[PDB]
Amino acid sequence: MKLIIVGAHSSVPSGYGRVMRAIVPRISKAHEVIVFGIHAFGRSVHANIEEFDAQTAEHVRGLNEQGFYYSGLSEFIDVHKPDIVMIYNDPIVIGNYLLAMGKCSHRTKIVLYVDLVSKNIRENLWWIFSHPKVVGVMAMSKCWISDICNYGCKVPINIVSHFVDTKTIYDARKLVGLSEYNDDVLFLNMNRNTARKRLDIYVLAAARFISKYPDAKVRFLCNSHHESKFDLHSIALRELVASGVDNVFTHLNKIMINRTVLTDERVDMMYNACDVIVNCSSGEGFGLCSAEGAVLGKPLIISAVGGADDYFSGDCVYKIKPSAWISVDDRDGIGGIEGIIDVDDLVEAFTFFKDEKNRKEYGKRVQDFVKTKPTWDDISSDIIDFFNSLLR
Amino acid sequence: MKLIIVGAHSSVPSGYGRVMRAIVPRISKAHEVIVFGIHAFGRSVHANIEEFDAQTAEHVRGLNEQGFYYSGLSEFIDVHKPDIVMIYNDPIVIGNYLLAMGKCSHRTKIVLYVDLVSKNIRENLWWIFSHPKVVGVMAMSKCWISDICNYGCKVPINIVSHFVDTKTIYDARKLVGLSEYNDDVLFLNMNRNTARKRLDIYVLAAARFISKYPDAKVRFLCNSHHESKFDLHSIALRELVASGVDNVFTHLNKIMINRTVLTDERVDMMYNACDVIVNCSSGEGFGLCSAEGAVLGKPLIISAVGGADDYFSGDCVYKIKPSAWISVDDRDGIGGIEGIIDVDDLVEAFTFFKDEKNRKEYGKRVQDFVKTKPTWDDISSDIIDFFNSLLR
Ligand SMILES: Nc1nc2c(ncn2[C@@H]2O[C@H](COP(=O)(O)OP(=O)(O)O[C@H]3O[C@H](CO)[C@@H](O)[C@H](O)[C@@H]3O)[C@@H](O)[C@H]2O)c(=O)[nH]1
Ligand SMILES: Nc1nc2c(ncn2[C@@H]2O[C@H](COP(=O)(O)OP(=O)(O)O[C@H]3O[C@H](CO)[C@@H](O)[C@H](O)[C@@H]3O)[C@@H](O)[C@H]2O)c(=O)[nH]1
């Protein structure tokens, strides 16, 4: 069959671009595939398969539609006359795409691959799952099935998770310039400083732990870009002052904040250099910044939310259940509800993993578990198996 | 003594407006008090005490200092030459007035009436507690004393709480327009639809309670302005669909939003009308609203936060403890951390008070307990004692 995939361009170094570099060349040997690549930063990584540069074509026609190029998708499908059109992004973006090709010449058969991260997304977006043209839906996890079914979806739903592979680098500690901290156990959170990822709880818990164990050789690593909503050292300073502990400043310095944007391998070096990988976010479609440490044999503390909860655990990970629920509607146009973990639960989780006997045991568990997990070849073969069932 | 209070003008229908209307006339008989009244809505409510209309004077000088009239305070103090100056606001506003009188000619003693609302307010505001002109600090509740100390306060700290004066009104639900709901038990949340107040939780717990008991004669009431940030019916609607319960739109109608602003009479009428008073906010300095329903012998469900926790005995009231803690830095320039109750805990509370024998019992309990509290005259006298102590 002739397939059209509407998603991130192969040049994009994002979460979406990561999977598009992997999934497309694997379906190329199964079906004739042509791509509608968006937000293109440079040239096409693939040498053979046809890919449309939607950002440059938008620049040529004289538009600034953020790089998505909705207005030209109508003309694009009419020429390429596909058997199946796949859409891969968050609720909002699909909503604009289906609105754009409402007057599209070819009678195609639409498949959705939604980026869902929170339950109870806004009502003005559920119409995409009931769309009389969408014949198939792809979810990132088992947890989203019930939701997608609640949003009024009468068509077959297929689970399409992700696989990940980080470079295993020996002597990583020294190479990222952490040589001075050889004695300390290092906790890592690679998540970006946004509300969803709740680094305020991370940094909050770090301060509680440090205050009750002021002499533990430990460091807490995290990232943050210029003047984002949470000032992480400021949050930690205030909780250390409230705790009554002496040497607030030296204790505060135990939280190490990276501000520069790293290369793909500095990220890999960072993963190898550390001892515990942490994610305490309120919403997860999948949670790449955790699975990436599981292959290296690092023990894991995760919030039991969304995709992370389904993907993990034969009791191989430290899972913290959300203690409360709030509305996320003020965050963005997607909205919904998310689960917040208790900070003190994160403190319990930390003291658990300052014991090296524990890090060794669970780090061995996660690696042996993620061994069984489906690779990109297993996943992409499941993608086409779902496509064949919708034609005959 | 000559005393100047920088605070809300008589006409202001806010939290600060209410306590200013009560405190000023009572200090007037002991001392000469003149008011730098800010944010005026019109005529001064007091016939004889001197109240300065700071907002209109601001307009006369063609300034827009949001009715605070920072530019005017310095000159106002130099003229009146008061013995003491009381600044009654939050830390940012106090900060700004302190800089305003930075180049003041009159040597004067400053007393701060701080409205705190969360632990861990930003450190760049802490300076106001150890400002050299600051001679004393007044706080609203016992819980805030240890925070102000942690912030580095070396001056006397006094507790100045609040009293509540709501009239008892006969035939109340007929008068507010709720005569169609005689059999229904009415839960009342009088709080403003802001983030702090967590009406997203209230509404969400209402939805979960309704889906649990579809035929329970119950109504939930709350408030919201033109275009706030939580669309309450939206949150409610989405949760009902999730539970799978039928007759969604009728069940949704049980949650009643009041968009219309209310006069002092109608607020009092609402309290009289309803069967259970609810406050599920993540931050309270003292926590008016709930205390307003307690003098009428109405049962209260409250979040055990800030001043609400100090003020009510756990035996006379249904207290819910926070389950999770989050940063608030994104909300305001003040910031801090606040505690959030579990939505399922609020459900337990709602089902506890659907039985009338519990409402009768806990109603009698609060009325008897709040009876033993200090009145406004007890509070005003304590205020004037504190000032005398600081003078000689
Ligand atoms: N090169 C580089 N990469 C970085 C850097 N910082 C983070 N990354 C990488 O950025 C990727 C982003 O992963 P997520 O954090 O899990 O994705 P997201 O922003 O939460 O958004 C969605 O993406 C995934 C689905 O494609 C989901 O895992 C996730 O739940 C969510 O739906 C991770 O692989 C992380 O290693 C950096 O400084 N440099
Ligand atoms: N006139 C009028 N008053 C209203 C209305 N709605 C609410 N109010 C009044 O608003 C008053 C104050 O509300 P609070 O519960 O105290 O919250 P807050 O003022 O917004 O927040 C902070 O300020 C207070 C300081 O005195 C603290 O009591 C409170 O805990 C918190 O720190 C209550 O007495 C209530 O009667 C209305 O529609 N009209």
Side-chain angles (χ1 to χ4, degrees):
Chain A
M1 68 168 190
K2 195 166 187 182
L3 216 178
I4 291 188
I5 305 96
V6 184
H9 203 272
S10 293
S11 61
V12 191
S14 63
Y16 311 99
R18 167 167 264 92
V19 322
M20 288 286 284
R21 282 180 283 261
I23 208 162
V24 176
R26 269 168 263 269
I27 307 160
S28 303
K29 56 183 183 176
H31 293 296
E32 182 187 37
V33 289
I34 64 106
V35 196
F36 195 80
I38 54 167
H39 311 121
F41 276 91
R43 287 200 285 262
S44 183
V45 180
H46 300 106
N48 283 53
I49 53 96
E50 189 191 306
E51 190 177 25
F52 191 78
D53 201 311
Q55 183 170 99
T56 58
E58 181 187 290
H59 282 206
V60 167
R61 208 143 73 99
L63 289 155
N64 50 258
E65 295 174 332
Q66 285 191 315
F68 299 96
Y69 193 54
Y70 305 108
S71 298
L73 192 72
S74 292
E75 193 267 355
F76 190 79
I77 291 165
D78 302 354
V79 184
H80 293 86
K81 290 187 269 286
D83 285 295
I84 284 173
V85 170
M86 176 195 164
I87 316 166
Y88 169 51
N89 224 96
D90 76 74
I92 304 290
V93 181
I94 303 110
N96 315 331
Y97 273 131
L98 290 165
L99 192 70
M101 65 193 196
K103 302 87 206 290
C104 210
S105 296
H106 188 74
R107 296 281 226 112
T108 181
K109 293 148 89 170
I110 311 162
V111 172
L112 302 184
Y113 188 34
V114 279
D115 184 69
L116 284 177
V117 90
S118 315
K119 310 182 197 299
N120 307 354
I121 56 163
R122 259 182 270 257
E123 318 92 50
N124 53 296
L125 303 163
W126 299 347
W127 58 275
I128 65 166
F129 302 102
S130 76
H131 205 82
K133 312 163 204 170
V134 174
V135 192
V137 169
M138 290 177 163
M140 288 184 293
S141 288
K142 188 175 74 74
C143 58
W144 305 121
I145 292 172
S146 62
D147 291 346
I148 297 156
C149 276
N150 290 327
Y151 307 141
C153 194
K154 308 262 86 182
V155 301
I157 315 98
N158 197 272
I159 303 160
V160 174
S161 79
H162 298 129
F163 179 70
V164 78
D165 192 3
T166 54
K167 211 88 69 264
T168 161
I169 298 161
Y170 150 78
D171 197 28
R173 273 285 229 276
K174 192 186 276 185
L175 279 159
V176 289
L178 288 179
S179 168
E180 249 67 55
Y181 316 89
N182 283 344
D183 216 317
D184 323 323
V185 14
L186 312 171
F187 288 84
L188 216 201
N189 190 324
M190 267 302 301
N191 297 286
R192 304 272 254 248
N193 196 1
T194 64
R196 204 184 94 233
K197 272 142 198 307
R198 283 266 146 252
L199 297 188
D200 59 325
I201 299 182
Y202 179 75
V203 145
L204 222 33
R208 298 266 178 94
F209 176 97
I210 293 163
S211 87
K212 71 149 88 191
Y213 299 107
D215 298 316
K217 289 93 81 67
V218 74
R219 303 278 151 166
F220 295 95
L221 309 217
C222 55
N223 316 311
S224 201
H225 77 121
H226 184 200
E227 278 177 293
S228 52
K229 299 219 152 204
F230 300 136
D231 181 336
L232 297 170
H233 276 150
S234 171
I235 295 170
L237 189 149
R238 282 176 269 151
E239 185 61 38
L240 286 164
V241 167
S243 79
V245 76
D246 294 60
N247 303 112
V248 176
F249 209 58
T250 123
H251 285 129
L252 172 62
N253 192 48
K254 294 174 180 183
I255 297 149
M256 299 173 72
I257 304 166
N258 161 63
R259 284 161 209 288
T260 60
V261 65
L262 304 326
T263 55
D264 219 9
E265 73 170 306
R266 285 299 303 262
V267 170
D268 287 359
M269 279 153 76
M270 281 297 204
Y271 276 129
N272 285 265
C274 298
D275 302 296
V276 186
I277 314 293
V278 186
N279 179 300
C280 53
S281 73
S282 48
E284 286 300 345
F286 186 83
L288 283 162
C289 286
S290 66
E292 286 188 54
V295 277
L296 297 180
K298 267 62 213 269
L300 284 166
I301 301 157
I302 60 158
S303 53
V305 289
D309 201 12
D310 289 355
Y311 190 82
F312 285 110
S313 189
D315 227 338
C316 64
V317 156
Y318 207 112
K319 283 180 154 179
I320 302 165
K321 288 180 171 67
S323 288
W325 293 77
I326 61 173
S327 174
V328 137
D329 291 299
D330 52 0
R331 221 231 309 288
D332 359 61
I334 37 149
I337 65 150
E338 274 169 9
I340 306 296
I341 64 149
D342 183 18
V343 60
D344 296 301
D345 282 325
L346 225 196
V347 176
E348 282 146 75
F350 287 159
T351 101
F352 190 80
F353 280 144
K354 87 184 189 90
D355 197 314
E356 80 149 345
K357 179 167 177 288
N358 287 329
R359 291 195 301 271
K360 187 190 180 70
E361 178 77 33
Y362 277 64
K364 185 184 165 67
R365 281 181 193 173
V366 292
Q367 199 186 246
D368 289 27
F369 182 72
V370 171
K371 263 200 167 67
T372 64
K373 284 290 169 176
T375 185
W376 284 118
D377 278 29
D378 292 331
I379 291 157
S380 304
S381 186
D382 193 45
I383 269 87
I384 64 157
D385 273 330
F386 182 50
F387 286 146
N388 295 308
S389 72
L390 288 160
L391 268 88
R392 204 83 289 178
Chain B
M1 64 153 203
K2 198 167 181 181
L3 180 258
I4 293 185
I5 303 171
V6 188
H9 192 269
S10 294
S11 49
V12 185
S14 78
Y16 309 151
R18 183 175 253 87
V19 2
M20 286 284 288
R21 277 189 298 278
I23 271 169
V24 175
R26 269 174 271 270
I27 300 174
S28 304
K29 46 195 168 191
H31 295 318
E32 185 198 355
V33 32
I34 64 106
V35 177
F36 194 85
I38 62 155
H39 305 141
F41 276 85
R43 294 267 195 91
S44 175
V45 91
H46 306 114
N48 274 44
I49 67 97
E50 195 208 293
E51 195 176 19
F52 185 78
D53 193 343
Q55 187 160 60
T56 72
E58 172 181 318
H59 291 139
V60 168
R61 268 220 272 166
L63 294 164
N64 38 260
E65 274 149 42
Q66 299 189 301
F68 290 91
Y69 195 35
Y70 296 112
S71 297
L73 188 68
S74 174
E75 161 190 21
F76 190 81
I77 280 160
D78 281 7
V79 166
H80 277 112
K81 310 207 210 304
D83 293 275
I84 285 177
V85 175
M86 170 190 148
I87 303 165
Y88 172 28
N89 229 97
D90 71 37
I92 290 166
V93 181
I94 294 179
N96 294 334
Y97 279 118
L98 281 171
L99 170 59
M101 53 209 283
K103 274 71 204 311
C104 226
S105 312
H106 180 72
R107 280 192 150 270
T108 174
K109 294 126 91 83
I110 304 168
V111 174
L112 312 183
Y113 200 18
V114 265
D115 174 56
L116 289 165
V117 131
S118 352
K119 292 169 182 292
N120 298 15
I121 70 164
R122 265 181 257 257
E123 338 76 40
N124 60 284
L125 312 163
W126 293 7
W127 61 273
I128 70 161
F129 291 117
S130 34
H131 188 75
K133 291 161 207 155
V134 166
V135 156
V137 176
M138 293 169 154
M140 293 167 307
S141 195
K142 186 214 142 288
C143 67
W144 305 116
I145 278 177
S146 82
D147 296 6
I148 298 170
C149 286
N150 292 338
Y151 296 158
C153 184
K154 305 229 83 186
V155 297
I157 302 166
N158 192 278
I159 307 156
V160 176
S161 79
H162 300 130
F163 189 62
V164 77
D165 196 288
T166 100
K167 317 294 160 63
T168 153
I169 294 163
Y170 173 74
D171 202 16
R173 44 215 280 166
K174 213 155 182 266
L175 285 164
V176 282
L178 302 166
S179 61
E180 298 283 312
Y181 318 117
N182 276 340
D183 299 335
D184 298 42
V185 299
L186 319 174
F187 289 87
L188 207 215
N189 200 325
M190 270 306 310
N191 289 320
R192 297 288 182 198
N193 197 349
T194 67
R196 215 181 101 215
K197 257 71 207 209
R198 280 290 156 215
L199 294 190
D200 63 329
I201 298 177
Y202 179 77
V203 158
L204 196 69
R208 282 200 185 165
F209 174 83
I210 286 160
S211 62
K212 195 93 80 173
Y213 310 96
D215 291 359
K217 280 86 82 73
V218 67
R219 298 298 159 125
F220 303 91
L221 322 191
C222 43
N223 307 295
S224 201
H225 89 93
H226 190 107
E227 271 246 36
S228 181
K229 278 162 74 70
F230 288 133
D231 186 340
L232 301 174
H233 272 154
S234 180
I235 280 100
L237 202 154
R238 281 178 274 159
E239 184 58 24
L240 288 152
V241 183
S243 60
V245 70
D246 290 17
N247 294 34
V248 182
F249 257 94
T250 60
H251 286 103
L252 186 273
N253 226 28
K254 301 176 187 187
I255 300 157
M256 298 180 72
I257 292 106
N258 165 63
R259 285 91 173 25
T260 66
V261 212
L262 265 30
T263 138
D264 263 13
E265 178 100 282
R266 305 202 100 253
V267 163
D268 272 17
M269 286 200 281
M270 285 288 271
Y271 282 124
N272 279 283
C274 296
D275 291 311
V276 193
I277 310 306
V278 186
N279 182 4
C280 59
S281 84
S282 59
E284 291 297 351
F286 173 76
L288 290 158
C289 292
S290 41
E292 304 184 308
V295 285
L296 305 179
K298 264 80 209 285
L300 320 188
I301 295 152
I302 70 165
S303 44
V305 291
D309 199 25
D310 294 335
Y311 186 74
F312 290 107
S313 155
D315 288 317
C316 72
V317 135
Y318 200 107
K319 286 194 180 170
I320 305 170
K321 293 187 184 97
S323 305
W325 287 79
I326 68 157
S327 180
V328 134
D329 290 3
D330 57 310
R331 212 247 305 294
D332 265 307
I334 305 151
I337 58 158
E338 303 200 301
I340 282 161
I341 63 160
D342 187 35
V343 53
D344 293 281
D345 278 356
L346 221 204
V347 164
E348 277 152 39
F350 285 160
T351 176
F352 179 75
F353 280 135
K354 75 189 209 70
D355 246 299
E356 79 142 318
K357 94 173 204 278
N358 286 316
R359 301 200 297 272
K360 178 182 262 66
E361 180 65 56
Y362 275 73
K364 181 174 164 63
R365 282 180 191 189
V366 271
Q367 197 171 241
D368 281 5
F369 171 77
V370 83
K371 197 198 296 292
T372 77
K373 285 300 179 180
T375 180
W376 272 133
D377 296 275
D378 289 348
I379 286 160
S380 305
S381 189
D382 176 39
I383 284 163
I384 188 260
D385 287 336
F386 187 56
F387 292 155
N388 292 338
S389 167
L390 300 159
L391 294 167
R392 199 87 295 184

